Amino acid sequence: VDALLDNGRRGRAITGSNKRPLKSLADMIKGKQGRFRQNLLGKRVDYSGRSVITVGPYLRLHQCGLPKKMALELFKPFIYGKLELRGLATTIKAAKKMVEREEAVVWDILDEVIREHPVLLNRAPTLHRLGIQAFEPVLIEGKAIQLHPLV
Amino acid sequence: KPLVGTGMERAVAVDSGVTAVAKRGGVVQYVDASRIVIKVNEDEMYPGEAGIDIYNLTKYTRSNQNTCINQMPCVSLGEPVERGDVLADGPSTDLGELALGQNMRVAFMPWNGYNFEDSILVSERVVQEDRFTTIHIQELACVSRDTKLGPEEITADIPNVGEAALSKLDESGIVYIGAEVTGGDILVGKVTPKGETQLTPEEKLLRAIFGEKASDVKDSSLRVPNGVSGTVIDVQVFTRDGVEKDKRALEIEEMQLKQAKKDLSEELQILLKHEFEKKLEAKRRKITQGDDLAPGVLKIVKVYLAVKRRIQPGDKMAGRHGNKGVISKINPIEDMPYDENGTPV
Amino acid sequence: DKIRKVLKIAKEPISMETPIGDDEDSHLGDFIEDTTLELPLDSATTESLRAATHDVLAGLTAREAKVLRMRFGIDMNTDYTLEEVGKQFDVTRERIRQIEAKALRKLRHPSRSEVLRSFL
Amino acid sequence: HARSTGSYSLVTQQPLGGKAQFGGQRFGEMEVWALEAYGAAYTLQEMLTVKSDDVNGRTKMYKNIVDGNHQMEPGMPESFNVLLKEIRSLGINIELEDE
Amino acid sequence: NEALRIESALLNKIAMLGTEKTAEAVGVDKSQISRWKRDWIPKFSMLLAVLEWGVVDDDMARLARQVAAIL
Amino acid sequence: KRNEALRIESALLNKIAMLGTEKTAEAVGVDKSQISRWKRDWIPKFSMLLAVLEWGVVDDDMARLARQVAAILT
Amino acid sequence: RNEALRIESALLNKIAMLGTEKTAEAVGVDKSQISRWKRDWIPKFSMLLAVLEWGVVDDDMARLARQVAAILTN
Amino acid sequence: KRNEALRIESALLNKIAMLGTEKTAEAVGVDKSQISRWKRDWIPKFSMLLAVLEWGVVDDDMARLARQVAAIL
Amino acid sequence: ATILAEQLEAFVDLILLRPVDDLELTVRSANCLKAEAIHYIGDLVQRTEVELLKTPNLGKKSLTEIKDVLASRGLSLG
Amino acid sequence: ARVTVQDAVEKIGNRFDLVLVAARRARQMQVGGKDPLVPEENDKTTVIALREIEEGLINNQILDVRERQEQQEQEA
Amino acid sequence: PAGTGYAYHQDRMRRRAA
Amino acid sequence: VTEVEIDGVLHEYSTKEGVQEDILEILLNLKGLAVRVQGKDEVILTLNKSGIGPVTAADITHDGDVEIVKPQHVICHLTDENASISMRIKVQRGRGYVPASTRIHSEEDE
Amino acid sequence: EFDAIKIALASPDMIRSWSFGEVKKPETINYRTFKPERDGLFCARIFGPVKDYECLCGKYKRLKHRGVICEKCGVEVTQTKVRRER
Ligand SMILES: [Zn+2]
């Protein structure tokens, strides 16, 4: 029972088939890897992407260069909705097939979708507030996010 | 080659077994993209032997990092070679010199913020000459196992995919060699048995309306990862000892057997007969012996794709002095700085 | 064949806290997905298919639409049998069979099920 | 690498790792601090309820986005339910008051 | 008895074929083949007797003999 | 043997259909359900056996053609 | 197909001329049977006649002749 | 009218045999495994209709086949 | 020079195919249209009302239905 | 078009009530229950709501007054 | 209870203290 | 040059027996072949060579309207007496640089 | 919905009130047909069904029968998500 609850406080933790101590009921709550800090204070998140950043010195301060493929994947439900609403797809499965085929009008829908939809750009060590900032996306034919030089 | 090196490039190139180095001096007798044959000089010839050396070059194979390992001959026909000379150039080697990158005409100047923090501005001629292009062979395995509902199959009959999607697959359900595939195409067509689907209402009705039948097999075909686009350069089939081989497995096996005989027969012709024939029966038995696979897995098909990554913004470049950099823009040749002679950087 | 079964018999299950080569924060349980989950596209497609069946059955005569809603469990309890439908329509079983066949034929019409076949 | 929706982790109903399981980006604790320092409470709430963990919330959000109703019904994240069942699996009674 | 002739001929031909071949053909474990045969051969022999397997071929042989006689 | 098995299965099923599942059951000595389920379960397997056993018989359409030719010539 | 459509139109036209009741009395079946055939089977019979009116291609004609000889040879 | 029905039925059965079971089954949407039964049921009835519709059918190819068969023997 | 001059000049200026299956009308209509080899709509419009009515088993209400459905689908005879 | 929100923040203040009132009004437009009060310039409902706030046509007080009067006239 | 949710939280208190 | 079709070759990551250059190197060589066509905008040239020696641009079968600017351009080498290279090179007129990737826009029935 | 979170000690009566049954055996899975065992750590009667609205034994495979407990196996028929709560 002690091992089940804590697998410590009893001199020697009991190990499994491998030589590694069994993870106890208490070990799944405490620590840097416990529920509180790995799953409750921070999380993995949908509608998110990541890519290398280039400069793009033509940008205005309020906008960022977003790759077209990245935008197409990040805004898929919005694209399905626009495809259904504008009559270009009868059902959601048909709209999915169009977005998979990347038909010419899917890109027009994607331009309409992100016209004034900001996206949050975040760099890995978020030391302060300005480590996350919202930008207006401008679609770029590439694979690297373009970041304004002043940010 | 490094236009500016330190003189240590030959040592690194040769000491690492990435090139083919002459074991014995002689005159090159036959050169080919795939092999070199040397007529050893009589001084280095042992009494009981034929003075012939055959170096078999490593053609396009995959490295631990999914790069291209390929050896090209660096000698011409009839050329004299001495012991320790480089006969083929391995990956990233030029005439026995370590050649990790490309020597490029670089200018140091700001140019409009397109190299702002560490960004790099590149000309379109750099892309046109394909001098930072790389080959990226990669494996993709389709394993058919023994499931409780029934064994998995690699048939070419795949529900819910049209005629065109199955055009790249042969009769046995495996993509052809040399076929240029795109992210999403089927490589190996596989189907798993299924049952007791438990269809919902307003779907039973739909199937009734369209007189369609729900398939008893679900599609588990190996498809190309989205984004990746290369050509199929190799296919390997591993069949369990008891299972019966398919058409493509038998076809591959015959190709390997003929290749084996060809290599052994050429070896005897270029150069002993007792070891030739004994090795042909061992090589033949090894080709058809049947593979010891994991338990349950019935048949494995490995497809090797060969991508070609050219260059683009976001790719990291570097010099040898710790100067990193990500390509930001690829410039037209008429936008680049140029000197009095009109040569752009 | 018993030899193969005995050899296939599952070995000791792998601990889900097994470190991956990095051994830092990658554990085996970080690579295992919930297989019994409905993808949001599948759920939305189910809702749209329910709506489409409703809007298509609407364009049917009263008794034919009722017969088709009964024969399949369409927004009701377990599906009824032809005999039960006769017990409720007070008509012969073969009559209900003919009615449902004709209703399905009418639903097969183009310009009446193009969206429904798009659902395939 | 990008992702709208995909596979989800087993014990915690959250997205998975990076680009080999088509998984999402970790919106870790310091990113939460940055959102808190801003006033972005709806951004934060949707980030840690409908985009990650609320099982019923994320399907409703997907549907609502599909028909152009950019509103959410946040709900309780599944990982907090896991934590409650794990503390209760010790001899500790932890419950929500004023049900 | 047509059924008994069919049973005899089928059993003889199956035995000549080989145990492993028959098991593979009918997808039955080699430990069950004797059971499968003893149970199912009479049923299928009776079935083929009803279906008149080979009777069309017998009449075809008769027609071939007659045509040979005419020519 | 695969295509021969398919052909033999088709011929067997055609013979049962022509005679009748009810009538075939009555003659064989089983119930109609048993014939209906043998058609689904074992007739393919027995057909593969016949393909291996080499008991294939002449297709009935070509049989009719041969009969007609033998009547026309004679 | 086109020949199938022509055949179907001809059959329906002749049915119209003769009279559904008259054709029912001539065929031994009821009026409703002819009317329902007009929609169930007549198209399929028309397609069958379309594919039959092509005749026999010489290659397959020789194939069938050889097979008919083989089945009729001791 | 019945004798003509039998004559056209024989001609049609011959034509079906020459065409091929696969083709006939595909043409009239009948499962191949059952096509033969179809011929027992609808070939005569259909024949009757052709006899009542004053449709004309001929069976030259069959005779041709006979000739060709004689060539082998 | 020609390319530059051209750009500088730019600067200095400153249904009928649908078969009978898409009619879904009374079986009277479909039967009469199939009899007269009127299978596609594209061949239906070229007909005229007075000639169509002459068809047997085709009277006032059948022609009314065919014409009104054609009108409802933006089609007419001629 | 929209780059900065300094006139809307000015007209409402607190930089947080602006978000809430703009969200209320943008949802009003998004659902088929309301129409823009400023000439639509191909903007999204969020930007349209911000542009209405800047003009002074929308406040938290205006919105609740309109909601109340719509409730009162629903009685009819 | 910090930013754009502060108002919401205050409103909750308005309903809790009754 | 826009595309090539060598006799017994399936992809550029293979090697031809008796040829010293790899197929990929052969294509990189053919990329630099200077040529002009007067009449047409698209022509398929043919190159068939046997026997030891360099296979140069002078060995390309020539029609009247195609002119090989430098006939000494080396295409490959044959290193075996019983070695044959037979290819059909596709030359077409265009403007600028268009990579094959952007040339697979639709596959145009390729 | 909920205003505060209360934490306290757990009594045997409280722990039994949470419980939906007593795990009596250490068995988990049947090693041939991997269905849950009768009273083990993975038990359908105690913890709920393993497939949506499908009884373990196989006598109930419709949403219509929702809300009844079987007799050949005693397994409640409901959603599988309840496996995360029981
Ligand atoms: Zn049960």
**Full 3-state SS string of B185-252:** CEEECCEEECCCCCCCCCCHHHHHHCCCCCCCEEECCEECCCCCCCEEEEEEEEEECCCCCCHHHHHH
d(CA A15, CA B91): 47
Q: Show the tokens assigned to G62.
A: 């020789």
Q: Domain residues of chain F, as ranges?
A: 1-74
Resolution (A): 3.1
Say which of B34, B60, B73 has its CB closest to residue L13.
B60
φ and ψ of A121, to 5 deg: -100, 130
Q: How many CB atoms lie within 10 A of CB B175?
A: 24
- Cβ separation K3–D45 shorter than 8 A: no
CB-nearest to F53 from E13, E46, E57 is: E13
Measured in Å, residue M32 CA sits from the centre of ligand 1 at 19
Does an interface of 3+ CB pairs under 8 Å exist between G and I?
yes
Q: Beta strand pairing status for M5-9 and D92-96?
A: antiparallel
User: What is the end-to-end Cα distance of chain G in Å, rounded?
Assistant: 42
Q: Is residue B303 exposed (0-12), middle (13-18) or buried (19+ Cβ within 10 Å)?
A: buried
Write the CB contacts of A115 (distance below 8 Å, at least 6 apart in sequence): J42, J43, J44
Q: Let me know: does L66 contact L17? Beta carbons within 8 Å.
A: no
What is the pairing mode between strands B217-219 and L66-68? unpaired
Which member of F9, F18, F65 has the closest CB to residue H18? F65
Cβ atoms of B134 and B68 closer than 8 Å: yes
**Contacting residues of E for G69, CB less than 8 Å apart:** none
Distance CA(C28)–CA(C35), nearest Å, equals 16
Residue of chain M minimizing CA distance to B196: M61
| Pair L42, L92: CB distance under 8 Å | yes
Inter-chain CB proximity C33 and D5 less than 8 Å: no
Phi, psi of A53 (to 5 degrees): -105, 130
Give the integer Cα–Cα distance in Å for L46 and L56. Answer: 12
Judging contacts by C-beta atoms under 8 Å, the chain F residues touching residue G67 are 62
Please state, in angstroms and rounded to a whole number, the distance separating the CA atoms of residues I43 and I52: 12
List the beta bridge partners of residue M65: none
Residues shown for chain F: 74
Q: Residue B127's closest CA among B318, B315, B337? A: B315
Inter-residue contact F69 to H59 (CB < 8 Å): no
Identify all chain B residues contacting A54, using CB atoms and an 8 Å cutoff.
119, 313-314, 326-329
CA dihedral L66, L67, L70, L76 (to 10 degrees): 20
Q: Does M10 touch chain D (CB under 8 A)?
A: yes
- Burial code of J10-35, b = ≥16 C-beta within 10 A, e = fewer? eebeeebbbbbbbbebbbbbbeeebe
Question: Nearest by CB to C77, which of M52, M64, M80?
Answer: M64
Is G9 at the interface with chain F, CB within 8 A? no
Nearest-angstrom CA–CA distance, A17 and B117: 52
Q: Angle at which helices H35-52 and G20-27 pack, to 10 degrees?
A: 120
Centre of ligand 1 to C-alpha G33, Å, is 50
Chain M residues with CB inside 8 Å of D55's CB?
Answer: 81
Nearest to G16 among I27, I35, I37 (CB): I35
Tally of domains within chain J = 1
SS3 L42: strand
Q: Locate the chain J residue with the closest alpha carbon to A63.
A: J3
Tell me the CA–centroid distance for residue M55 and ligand 1, in Å. 5
Determine the residue type at A131.
G
Rounded (5°) CA angle B220-B224-B226: 110
Task: Spell out which residues of chain L touch residue B60, defining contact as CB-CB under 8 Å.
Answer: 13
Residue C5 DSSP SS3: helix
Chain I: residue whose CA lies nearest to G17: I56
Which residue in D52, B325, D53, D36 sits closest to A131, CA to CA? D36
Domain range for J30 is 1-76
Distance separating alpha carbons of residues M46 and M38, to the nearest angstrom: 9
* φ and ψ at residue L49, rounded to 5 degrees: -140, 145
Method for structure elucidation: cryo-EM
CA pair distance A103, B161, nearest whole angstrom: 19
Residue L47: C-alpha distances to residues C90, H42, L22 (Å): 85, 65, 17
Cβ–Cβ under 8 Å, residues A137 and A117: yes
Query: Tokens representing A142?
Result: 């590439």
Mind telling me how many Å the CA of C16 is from chain B's nearest CA? 21
Q: Is M57 annotated as a binding residue?
A: yes
C-alpha of L25 from chain center: 11
Q: Judge: C30–D17 Cβ closer than 8 Å, yes or no.
A: yes
In one-letter notation, the amino acid at residue H27 is A
Per the structure, the complete domain to which residue C72 belongs is given by: 37-118
**M43 is annotated as contributing to ligand binding:** no
- On chain A, the residues whose CB falls within 8 A of the CB of B325 are none
Alpha carbon distance M73, M59 (integer Å): 9
K11: part of which helix (H) or strand (E)?
Answer: helix K6-16
CB-CB contact of M60 with M77 (8 Å): yes
| Residue A18 CB neighbours (<10 A) | 13
Q: Is M66 helix (H, G, I), strand (E, B) or coil?
A: coil
Would you call C105 an interface residue with chain I, using a CB distance cutoff of 8 Å? Answer: no
Rg (CA), chain C: 25
Total number of residues shown for chain K: 18
What is the C-alpha separation between B205 and B203, in angstroms, rounded? 5
M70 is known to lie in a ligand binding site: yes
Q: Which residues of B touch C68 (CB under 8 A)?
A: 205
Distance from CA of A121 to the nearest CA of C (A): 25
The nearest CA of chain J is from the CA of A142 a distance in Å of 25
What count of residues does chain D have? 99
A9: left (phi over 0), alpha (psi -120 to 50) or beta: left
What the block records as the tokens of C102 is 């004709």
Cβ atoms D9, A30 nearer than 8 A: no
Q: What is the DSSP letter of A131?
A: G
For Cα atoms B182, B185, B187, give the angle at the middle one, nearest 5 degrees: 115
- Put simply, whether F57 touches H (Cβ < 8 Å) is no
What is chain B's length? 345
Residue C91: give its domain's CATH number.
Answer: 1.10.10.10
Question: Strand, coil or helix: what is A64?
Answer: strand
Residue I24 to residue I66: CA distance in whole angstroms: 10
The continuous run of DSSP H or E covering B89 comes out as: strand B86-89
D81, D96 Cβ separation under 8 angstroms: no
Cα(L16)–Cα(L10) distance, integer angstroms: 10
From residue C52, alpha-carbon distances to A80, B205, B259, C109, L73 in Å are 17, 12, 60, 15, 67
For A40, which DSSP code?
I
DSSP one-letter code for B290: -
Nearest to A80 by CA among A89, A71, A70: A89
Structural fold of domain L1-110: RNA Polymerase Alpha Subunit; Chain A, domain 2 (2.170.120)
Interface residue G72 vs chain E (CB under 8 A): yes
**Cβ within 8 Å, pair C78-M64:** yes
CA distance F29 to F38: 13
Question: Cβ contacts (< 8 Å) between G13 and chain I: which residues?
Answer: 35-36
Return the closest-CA partner of residue J28 out of J8, J2, J3, J57. Answer: J57
